[PDB]
Design a protein around this ligand. Structure first.
Ligand SMILES: [Mg+2]
Ligand SMILES: [Mg+2]
Ligand SMILES: [Mg+2]
Ligand SMILES: [Mg+2]
Ligand SMILES: [Mg+2]
Ligand SMILES: [Mg+2]
Ligand SMILES: [Mg+2]
Ligand SMILES: [Mg+2]
Lengths: 201, 258, 167
RNA sequence: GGCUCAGGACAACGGUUGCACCCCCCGCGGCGGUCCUAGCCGGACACCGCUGGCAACCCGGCGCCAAGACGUGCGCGCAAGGGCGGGCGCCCGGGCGAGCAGCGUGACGCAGCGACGGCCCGCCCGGGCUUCCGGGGCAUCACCCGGUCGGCGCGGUCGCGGCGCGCCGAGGGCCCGACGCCUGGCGGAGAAUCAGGGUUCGACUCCGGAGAGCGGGCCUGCGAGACGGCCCGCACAUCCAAGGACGGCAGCAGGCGCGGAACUUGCCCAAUGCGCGGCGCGCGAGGCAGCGACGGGGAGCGCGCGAGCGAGGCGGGCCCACAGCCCCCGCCGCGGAGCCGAGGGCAAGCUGGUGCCAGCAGCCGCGGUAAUUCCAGCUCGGCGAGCGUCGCGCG
């Protein structure tokens, strides 16, 4: 086929939408652009003019993803490490060699991932609902059938204080007993030499 | 050449004094690391299943151990493969049975029931005196127990009495001629005798000669000579006072029991 | 890859021995660090994960080290100027490569800062009045990541002086 | 853990030493002083919602959230390494047979632990190398080696070491058999045979070694030069909606080829054990069953003048994870011998055919009109649910 599945996502409001393109002359300006490259929407006169877009990724005709730093218009193979994009590991330290499409944009693409950073005054079909709420104590403190709520974390109740105090006391008494044992052993051996590391300070 | 440590144990390759049956199964329990090594120990399950007969299978022994019904030196142990060794304390409070693990004349592990007056301690053999971190003197024992700041008068191959409740020394027995000993390895395991000579060969093993009370004399190397008190034993010993009978006498005993 | 196994060598009689197993990781080796005197620039040291999880560090570039004057018991931290002699090869000297046993020149400022007047070993005082002092390296860079040493004196000082004087 | 024996012949391997040249997870016992917001710190991803490419395999972009995860870090000076600190012929404690450890002091360096405290030490199992002895055949293989032998210095290694590099000198091994070549060469504990002394074998149950199509390389991890882990070349092989993707049964069953020769594509974790765990899960390890004249052991096809007894059939127990089988209790009741040979070695003889033909015969030999030996009937002999034929080993 000869098209491009342009997917648009709005991060300020959490809304995304998709559409189709049936030409290249229109996208010639899009050609030769890399990721994180500003692309004005005036190319699309259908309520996208004057809006600044950012290219974030896409999939070539065969489906191979796009990698940032290759700097190429065709796909290539490299040895992918752990934690890298476009690779799911199975063993802890395993690698894999697989193909990926180049970062530079070209006609061979079939899907384009773009984001909106700055637009004009006109509003477009493309509020952010929050399916979850902060769970850490610091987060919530900064910010403000059945009843289901998240369990709070990082809260220091009574028993945490008792545990910490007990641990501190245990360590202190351990050190005190060791000091006493060293003192009594040193008091002994009055008739022999000794060689231990003297505590400094 | 195996790439790592071994975890299994074939039944035929197991120690002889365990007395495992040839056709019981392909495998045998593999004791885990602990106070005693593989060749001078015995797994707990063997005692709990093939000796006292309190359990008929692995699962029963595991359940019993999880319920914490067995104490080893006052500390409950939940491992079915925990290694038990010489001069241990084996008390089961729920049935008021307390035993001490020792060697019989035939050279096998045995349980000697004991009293409460002497069940709160154990005897340990000191094998090493070394300086640890900061130059602090230390000592180690045959049961993998390290003590700090010991008395200078204690030397190697001595015997130490440590209280189980706390783990502190109370008295020690010097290694010398005329002290009752017990043999813990070799062809003479389980015998009791008194040291008569100590012959040291430079750069090689030291040989110890002891005489049995009846008058018999035998030799063994110092690596498996265990002092168990002065003149008289400090702890209880099996009914026979470490006297190994001859084949003819043993056959007479067998016929009498038949 | 690199190995120190003896299975690839000949026997004492000169015969060739057969290869009866593949390569093992017990007997591996690694490329030399080739620590370089400094003379995107700075001290660089790398860490190596050795057998058993132990950590070994090889220095690739360094410029300073601790040097001790044993006779007077004076130890300071000094800057290494350049290598002047090596008993293994002249190529190491030309490249200014640091290894154990190298003879180097260190700055005299830390040692002339004091005791330039005290009546000590005369042969060292004359060096102190100058700008550089002959020294030797005692540590192993490539294993510990340091280049420490001591100030020469006695017969060895005369030996090295005679060695590097006619040049 | 399981499979197999290709490779490899002062090697592997067996017994006997050592590390004062070494590393070590779990577990057990100790130990626990850390220089310069602590009513408790910071940011992310996974799953998931929205949106999409691609034949499949695979993944993309945006978006709020957790930690016994990651990062930073409150804390009584402490990691590695480095300089100095004993003698006057030898011998007569922390510790040794053995100047080995630890410590003090002068300089460097701030490693590890710490948002529910463990860095470190000892033991243990295991590994790495190492001393002495043993360790196939061919002399139509008699001279061989040139990092090959030793010394000095550095590097690398967990660590010693020609292990590697530079310089120096020349050496090392051999008829007490070097070097070279060959092996239908894994080794031992052991197996076959049998007066005693010995000969042959040793794929396979236990131990040790090596390998996962051939040859190499590597990440993770205490531990792998791992292959039911990844990368490359070579040789094979599979899907393709032709642009692409993808595999390693010398694991259990099963299939092809090969050969003289070798079993079910079954049930179960109930027993023995391993892994992770509190009242259990998983395991083609292992167990049960099926085929099975490799082979070993025990009974029988009658006794006596009437009875009795099996095999077998039908039910009930016991056993079994469930089913069998054995064994026990009731009713009814199939008794079936073959393979070799009859001249000698070697125990066992009468008729009819054929006529040096057909055939027998390990050897001697028979057969050309009685054939004691061929082909048949009768009779007889040996072993017997087994007998005979072919090859190998011992005798
Ligand atoms: Mg600090
Ligand atoms: Mg943390
Ligand atoms: Mg072979
Ligand atoms: Mg094996
Ligand atoms: Mg392998
Ligand atoms: Mg491999
Ligand atoms: Mg495997
Ligand atoms: Mg496979």
């Amino acid at each position: 086929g000869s098209f491009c599945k342009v997917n648009i996502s709005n991060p300020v409001t959490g809304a995304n939408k998709s559409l189709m393109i049936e030409d290249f002359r229109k996208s010639q300006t899009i050609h030769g652009l890399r990721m994180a490259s500003e692309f004005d929407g005036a190319a699309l006169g259908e309520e996208y003019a004057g809006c600044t877009f950012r290219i974030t990724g896409g999939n070539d005709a065969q489906g191979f993803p796009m990698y940032q730093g290759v700097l190429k218009s065709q796909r290539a193979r490299l040895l992918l490490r752990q934690g890298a994009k476009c690779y799911l590991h199975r063993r802890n330290g395993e690698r894999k060699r697989k193909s990926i499409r180049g970062c530079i944009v070209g006609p061979d693409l079939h899907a384009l991932s773009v984001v909106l950073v700055d637009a004009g005054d006109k509003t477009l079909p493309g509020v952010v609902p929050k399916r979850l709420v902060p769970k850490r104590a610091s987060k919530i403190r900064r910010l403000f059938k059945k009843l289901k709520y998240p369990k709070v974390q990082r809260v220091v109740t009574d028993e945490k204080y008792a545990r910490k105090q007990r641990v501190i006391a245990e360590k202190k008494e351990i050190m005190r007993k060791s000091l006493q044992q060293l003192e009594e052993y040193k008091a002994l051996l009055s008739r022999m030499g000794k060689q231990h590391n003297i505590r400094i300070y | 050449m195996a790439r790592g440590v071994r975890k299994h144990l074939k039944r035929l390759n197991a120690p002889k004094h365990w007395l495992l049956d040839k056709m019981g199964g392909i495998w045998a329990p593999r004791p885990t690391n602990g106070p005693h090594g593989l060749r001078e120990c015995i797994p707990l399950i063997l005692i709990l299943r093939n000796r006292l007969h309190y359990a008929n299978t692995y699962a029963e022994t595991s359940m019993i151990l999880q319920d914490k019904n067995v104490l080893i030196d006052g500390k409950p142990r939940t491992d079915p493969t925990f290694p038990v060794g010489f001069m241990d304390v084996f008390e089961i409070p729920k049935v008021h049975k307390t035993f001490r693990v020792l060697y019989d004349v035939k050279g096998r592990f045995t349980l000697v029931p004991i009293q409460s007056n002497e069940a709160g301690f154990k005897l340990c053999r000191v094998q090493k005196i070394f300086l640890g971190d900061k130059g602090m003197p230390y000592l180690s024992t045959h049961d993998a127990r390290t003590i700090r700041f010991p008395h200078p008068d204690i030397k190697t191959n001595d015997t130490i009495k440590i209280n189980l409740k706390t783990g502190k020394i109370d008295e020690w027995y010097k290694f010398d001629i005329g002290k009752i000993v017990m043999v813990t390895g070799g062809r003479n395991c389980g015998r009791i005798g008194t040291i008569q000579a100590i012959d040291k060969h430079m750069g090689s093993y030291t040989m110890i000669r002891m005489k049995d009370t009846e008058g018999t004399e035998f030799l063994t190397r110092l690596c498996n000579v265990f002092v168990i008190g002065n003149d008289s034993p400090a702890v209880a010993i099996p009914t026979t006072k470490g006297i190994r009978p001859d084949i003819i006498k043993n056959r007479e005993l067998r016929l009498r029991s038949i | 890859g690199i190995t120190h196994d003896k299975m690839y060598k000949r026997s004492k009689t000169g015969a060739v021995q057969g290869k009866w197993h593949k390569k093992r990781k017990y007997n591996l080796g690694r490329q030399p660090a080739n620590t370089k005197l400094i003379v995107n620039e700075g001290q660089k040291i790398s860490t190596i994960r050795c057998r058993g999880g132990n950590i070994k560090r090889r220095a690739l570039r360094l410029s300073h080290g601790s040097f001790a004057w044993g006779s007077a018991d004076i130890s300071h931290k000094a800057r290494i100027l350049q290598v002047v002699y090596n008993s293994t090869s002249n190529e190491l000297v030309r490249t200014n490569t640091l290894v154990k046993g190298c003879v180097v020149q260190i700055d005299s400022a830390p040692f002339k800062s004091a005791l330039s007047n005290d009546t000590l070993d005369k042969e060292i005082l004359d060096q102190i009045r100058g700008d550089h002092i002959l020294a030797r390296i005692s540590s192993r860079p490539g294993q510990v990541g340091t280049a420490d040493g001591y100030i020469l004196e006695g017969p060895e000082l005369l030996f090295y002086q005679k060695k590097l004087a006619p040049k």
